[PDB]
Write a protein that binds this ligand. Sequence first.
Ligand SMILES: *[C@@H]1O[C@H](CO)[C@@H](O)[C@H](O)[C@H]1NC(C)=O
Ligand SMILES: *[C@@H]1O[C@H](CO)[C@@H](O)[C@H](O)[C@H]1NC(C)=O
Ligand SMILES: *[C@@H]1O[C@H](CO)[C@@H](O)[C@H](O)[C@H]1NC(C)=O
Ligand SMILES: *[C@@H]1O[C@H](CO)[C@@H](O)[C@H](O)[C@H]1NC(C)=O
Ligand SMILES: *[C@@H]1O[C@H](CO)[C@@H](O)[C@H](O)[C@H]1NC(C)=O
Ligand SMILES: *[C@@H]1O[C@H](CO)[C@@H](O)[C@H](O)[C@H]1NC(C)=O
Ligand SMILES: *[C@@H]1O[C@H](CO)[C@@H](O)[C@H](O)[C@H]1NC(C)=O
Ligand SMILES: *[C@@H]1O[C@H](CO)[C@@H](O)[C@H](O)[C@H]1NC(C)=O
Ligand SMILES: *[C@@H]1O[C@H](CO)[C@@H](O)[C@H](O)[C@H]1NC(C)=O
Ligand SMILES: *[C@@H]1O[C@H](CO)[C@@H](O)[C@H](O)[C@H]1NC(C)=O
Ligand SMILES: *[C@@H]1O[C@H](CO)[C@@H](O)[C@H](O)[C@H]1NC(C)=O
Ligand SMILES: *[C@@H]1O[C@H](CO)[C@@H](O)[C@H](O)[C@H]1NC(C)=O
Ligand SMILES: *[C@@H]1O[C@H](CO)[C@@H](O)[C@H](O)[C@H]1NC(C)=O
Ligand SMILES: *[C@@H]1O[C@H](CO)[C@@H](O)[C@H](O)[C@H]1NC(C)=O
Lengths: 1017, 124, 86, 39, 48
Amino acid sequence: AYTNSFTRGVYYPDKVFRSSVLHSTQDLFLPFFSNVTWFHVNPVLPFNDGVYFASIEKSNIIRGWIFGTTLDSKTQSLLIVNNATNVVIKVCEFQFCNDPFESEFRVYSSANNCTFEYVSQFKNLREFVFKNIDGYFKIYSKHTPIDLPQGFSALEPLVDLPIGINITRFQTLLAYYVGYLQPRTFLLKYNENGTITDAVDCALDPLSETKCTLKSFTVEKGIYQTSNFRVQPTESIVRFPNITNLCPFDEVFNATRFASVYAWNRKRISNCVADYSVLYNLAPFFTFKCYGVSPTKLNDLCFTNVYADSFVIRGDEVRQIAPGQTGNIADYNYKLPDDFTGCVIAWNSNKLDSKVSGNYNYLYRLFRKSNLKPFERDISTEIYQAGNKPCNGVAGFNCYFPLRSYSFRPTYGVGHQPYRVVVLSFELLHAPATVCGPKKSTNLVKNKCVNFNFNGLKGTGVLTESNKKFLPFQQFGRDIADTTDAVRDPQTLEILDITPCSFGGVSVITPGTNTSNQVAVLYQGVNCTEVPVAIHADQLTPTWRVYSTGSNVFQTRAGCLIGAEYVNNSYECDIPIGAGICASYQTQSIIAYTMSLGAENSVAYSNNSIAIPTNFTISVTTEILPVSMTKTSVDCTMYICGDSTECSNLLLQYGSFCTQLKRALTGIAVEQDKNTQEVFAQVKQIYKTPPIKYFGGFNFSQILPDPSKPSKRSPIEDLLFNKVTLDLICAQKFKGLTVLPPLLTDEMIAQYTSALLAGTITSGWTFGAGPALQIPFPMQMAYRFNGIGVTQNVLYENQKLIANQFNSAIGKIQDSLSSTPSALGKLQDVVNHNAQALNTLVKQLSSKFGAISSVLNDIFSRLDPPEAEVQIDRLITGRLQSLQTYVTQQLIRAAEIRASANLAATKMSECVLGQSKRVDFCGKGYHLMSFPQSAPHGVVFLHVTYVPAQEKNFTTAPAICHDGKAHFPREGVFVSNGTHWFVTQRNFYEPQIITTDNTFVSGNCDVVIGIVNNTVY
Amino acid sequence: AEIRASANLAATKMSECVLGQSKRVDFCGKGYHLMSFPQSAPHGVVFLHVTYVPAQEKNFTTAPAICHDGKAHFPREGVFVSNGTHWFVTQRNFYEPQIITTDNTFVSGNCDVVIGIVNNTVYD
Amino acid sequence: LTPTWRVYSTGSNVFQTRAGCLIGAEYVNNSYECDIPIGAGICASYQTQSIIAYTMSLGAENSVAYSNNSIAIPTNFTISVTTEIL
Amino acid sequence: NKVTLADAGFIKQYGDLICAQKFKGLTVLPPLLTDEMIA
Amino acid sequence: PVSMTKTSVDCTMYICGDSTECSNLLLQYGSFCTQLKRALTGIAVEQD
Ligand SMILES: *[C@@H]1O[C@H](CO)[C@@H](O)[C@H](O)[C@H]1NC(C)=O
Ligand SMILES: *[C@@H]1O[C@H](CO)[C@@H](O)[C@H](O)[C@H]1NC(C)=O
Ligand SMILES: *[C@@H]1O[C@H](CO)[C@@H](O)[C@H](O)[C@H]1NC(C)=O
Ligand SMILES: *[C@@H]1O[C@H](CO)[C@@H](O)[C@H](O)[C@H]1NC(C)=O
Ligand SMILES: *[C@@H]1O[C@H](CO)[C@@H](O)[C@H](O)[C@H]1NC(C)=O
Ligand SMILES: *[C@@H]1O[C@H](CO)[C@@H](O)[C@H](O)[C@H]1NC(C)=O
Ligand SMILES: *[C@@H]1O[C@H](CO)[C@@H](O)[C@H](O)[C@H]1NC(C)=O
Ligand SMILES: *[C@@H]1O[C@H](CO)[C@@H](O)[C@H](O)[C@H]1NC(C)=O
Ligand SMILES: *[C@@H]1O[C@H](CO)[C@@H](O)[C@H](O)[C@H]1NC(C)=O
Ligand SMILES: *[C@@H]1O[C@H](CO)[C@@H](O)[C@H](O)[C@H]1NC(C)=O
Ligand SMILES: *[C@@H]1O[C@H](CO)[C@@H](O)[C@H](O)[C@H]1NC(C)=O
Ligand SMILES: *[C@@H]1O[C@H](CO)[C@@H](O)[C@H](O)[C@H]1NC(C)=O
Ligand SMILES: *[C@@H]1O[C@H](CO)[C@@H](O)[C@H](O)[C@H]1NC(C)=O
Ligand SMILES: *[C@@H]1O[C@H](CO)[C@@H](O)[C@H](O)[C@H]1NC(C)=O
């Protein structure tokens, strides 16, 4: 039968204790919700990559297993039996009987050579995990007092056996379930007492991939870039030249007599198959040193200009056959270019060249005027002159013959014994190739993703017939990036274009893990006709699938959306997809739609119709502005090195990096206090509110300091300081990352805010321009109504209604902040950004950066200084880069916060210390006044504005013709109830009788279009 | 980027403080801005801001409106203040008491709504 | 002691602050304008003769005589000329 | 018609400089608001 | 100007194009690609 494995088979991947962490592990796991085979009480199930084995029973019916390859005597098989006394393990040549199954003698007949033996110690669930890696048979296990259960439980290591055999099949020695392992990435959640309490299978589905991307088990609503889909190569091809003759290496290496180093011999190698394995049969212990390549890779490459230079030298000069070496041999005999690509093969040839008597067939130049250029040969015998004399003639004093013989003898020490040297020079500068290693050519697959190899150029992509034409000397084409984009096929000589395999970005639209587990997927920049759908795991690198269902596939200019039904109704954007398309959870399913820009409203325009408001609303709105960020300090050496003195000494050689970082962070830290001072320290005097808090009916209790509180904060300020969350700090501290306190405490900032509020309440805007002049609050409001163009009588006649509207509006602010979650989101964003940056810095200390380990002490305690310093250099470079990135991001964030703080200071000056006429600067409507409230890292402004309401249509005229004079309203607009004509102020309907004092006259009523006949009393 | 923000601010101040008179509070100095003068400085600009600062304040009694002949009067371009026994209308930022006439105030309704209205003669 | 040198803790010249331990300054109870900022509201200055730590002063307290019928009006003015450097 | 865009971030159908960038892993995403909605 | 081009980078494709050994090595340089992606996503959201 078959059943669902659920979330079972997780096993502790390491022996390290961990607590309150989310750790990511790549290992052989049992994929979640896997189809496991259920057997009941059996056959010989295969061993694919490791096995999860479960056994629900209460009678020890299951006793062991037999892992092996043929399970016969012709091979070696592992045997594991659980006898009531012990457990027996035996890798040994077993002729297992056909139905093994208490008489243990009924399992196998013969037990030939045994290379490994070992002995050790409500139904029940015995879970096991068997793996075979690097010759080790690992077993993890767990017992649970109990269709597999549907809970989470993790398996602990039991034993690793060095059994040294391949295991392809196994059989249970007699309900047991058998699942299989695959290479997977898992996100494991460790408990506080170090217990794995949950896992996420990253490759299970798109939501799991989102969870692993965010390193969390809960995903908020939104759209997340999770990974990129990548089409995988279907097959592989190899295209090498058709040449089959072997290279003439025997006539080079196996030569009766080699040349002299001064007249060294050069041989051209072409049109042949170069099998370098034929080497390694030279005078044993020979030197085979390569430059630009590795000896083990020569058989896999193709070469352009292969030359074999052969000569004989003395052993102690073999070190001189290398780039940049100096000496008689390297200066006057045989020089190699500094940029030499090739291989030097040297081997002692005492038994070929040495002569008991002295061999004079091998000479070397000892004296030359100048040095030689690379690969140059000098075969002249002129007399070298070390003296100023006209040496022209024969040898003598300061006149030496330039060549001297080695005189190799069998009795010499190794250092002066003959060595035969062969230098192979080749250009791996691709180019058309004639010498190639032994490699078989497959067929050419076009218009299909493949792994390809053209004369050693390896790659993956799609090959198409090219319209480009190469010149005879050209074999590859290159693009702007200098990557090969065209290749001439070595056999047919046609030109093929190389294109990358289809790939793209994938985004996951989630309504929120809380709300639902449904997801939609956006394949970005792709049309649905091209969305990968390959069934087998050969495509869509994510490796999960979101199959179509008809109405669940939509095409947007941002890409193809799968899993969201498109609707024709328009809404506000909930989750932005792009190109006008948004998505949301209907409730039940995810729906995509075109976003609405808002509701239409045709304004009734006429040449004589005017709408005048008849009422108003006092609106109180909120504006939240960051003012400062956490001041941070970094102990550079403690972060980079951390208790390692060797690392500190090595660090000293890297420059003034830490001084620069400290200076930049100090600049940011000082700027934060400057920001706070510029926002809140505007007042010179700490004004205090009057003990008797009557203000004409206006109630400031929610904004004024509350004397009960130990901090003397207002109720709204307390709500703000509780809504913004401001052991991880200790972990950061241990790495040298510290937070510096702000200069102004929250009590001092609240005191500044209180002084500002008292000044504005008791004196209006006068305390911002000089001495604070007291004025009754209703009179101040009358001034602020005169500011927005409303006559004073409006306030005094509506004092109680205005006061009540203000009080109710101020009352709703507490709810509005506390209710809407993402209200303080800007200040919380500042806090979260700092915390995230520091946590990222701490987490970067576990990165190896290509070194063998991220622990400096382990590197120093296991390596000699020469190589240790290389590894430590990798680590120090990586950590320095982490610090530099952190400081640069901090500088950019501090610039942005400084802009926000300059804006907050401007708002403090122009909305709290005065009444602003700038539209939308201090709230939506017509600004009346504003109140500041401190917030953990910023300032909240409560803007009080006047909003017209209950508008009424009237008929209007540009002017009034009376007595023959044209009349225009001095401080208002002409309106008509329908039959009578009044003059009204603009923002409040207050009709008045048209007199010659509320009106002025200019010209006759013959030029003013629209002029109307009436009487100006 | 920081210096460019500073130079944008300096250009704005050159436009609104030197080429005009600014109503924005504290944009062109502390006090009510009258005018400003630019002076070039080595790598920047210096603005000499000339502002009007009120001084030598005196307390007065004040009322929202004045009741006369059963009519409520609100000041046109001033506030009502009292020497102690008589009543004047003054401009806000400088003590310039004037006899309350029916030319520097306006009538709006009766003296039965304003919370604080005071009886006195509005000379016609 | 990594910095080797040590400043003697004479008792009256050791103080605890949220910024850390201050040694070589005497905490007083007067409030002056901040001269050298230590942090968390604490500043330092040369008294004259020794270094003193103190809680910084936000400014001189003031109380505006608010009533529901009293208005302060300036009788005079000053023409001020301030400087702004950009 | 006076400002020339380079990519504009719209669907590319498999089969110049944009192609080079895309093959190297660099893409342009479309703005949320279209030109018509901004208009 | 109001907005600029929104850009996305496939870090693995740029650094390790079509090489798998390079990708498995790149898995050891920490969260660099994740930080780059987060920064560019922040820019892209800021444009809208
Ligand atoms: C972890 O184990 C400890 C053992 O002392 C126990 O006290 C604690 O409650 C456990 N944690 C849980 C149950 O979350
Ligand atoms: C040299 O000769 C030996 C013996 O015939 C042979 O095994 C070897 O491969 C030859 N070396 C080369 C480089 O051909
Ligand atoms: C995607 O490909 C199909 C098939 O060629 C085509 O009809 C469609 O227009 C393409 N998508 C876009 C956005 O052009
Ligand atoms: C006044 O408005 C109406 C309707 O919009 C229009 O027909 C008429 O021409 C306008 N007046 C004049 C003088 O055009
Ligand atoms: C103005 O609005 C208020 C509600 O805030 C209402 O009580 C009052 O009656 C309205 N005034 C008029 C004249 O409708
Ligand atoms: C002012 O408002 C607070 C909170 O809404 C309330 O408790 C208090 O009684 C109010 N004061 C007056 C004088 O109405
Ligand atoms: C003004 O008139 C238009 C059309 O005549 C009407 O739709 C609108 O509701 C009116 N507005 C008011 C405030 O009466
Ligand atoms: C004219 O305005 C008066 C208010 O002053 C109003 O009582 C009257 O109804 C208006 N005329 C018409 C025709 O509505
Ligand atoms: C307004 O009165 C004047 C006075 O003679 C007259 O000429 C004009 O035609 C009148 N206009 C209308 C629209 O009645
Ligand atoms: C205004 O009255 C208050 C309270 O009596 C007083 O302290 C203040 O000095 C007075 N103002 C002037 C300018 O005399
Ligand atoms: C009242 O004003 C009058 C001027 O009309 C003058 O007696 C003096 O300034 C004030 N009187 C008192 C007692 O303040
Ligand atoms: C002003 O005069 C009216 C009319 O007699 C009276 O009702 C009112 O009380 C007077 N005001 C004061 C403050 O005495
Ligand atoms: C006006 O102020 C006085 C003194 O400050 C106070 O006794 C009175 O209650 C206030 N007005 C009202 C209506 O309470
Ligand atoms: C106003 O102040 C000036 C000094 O700035 C002084 O000379 C003058 O007498 C003052 N005027 C009054 C009326 O106090």
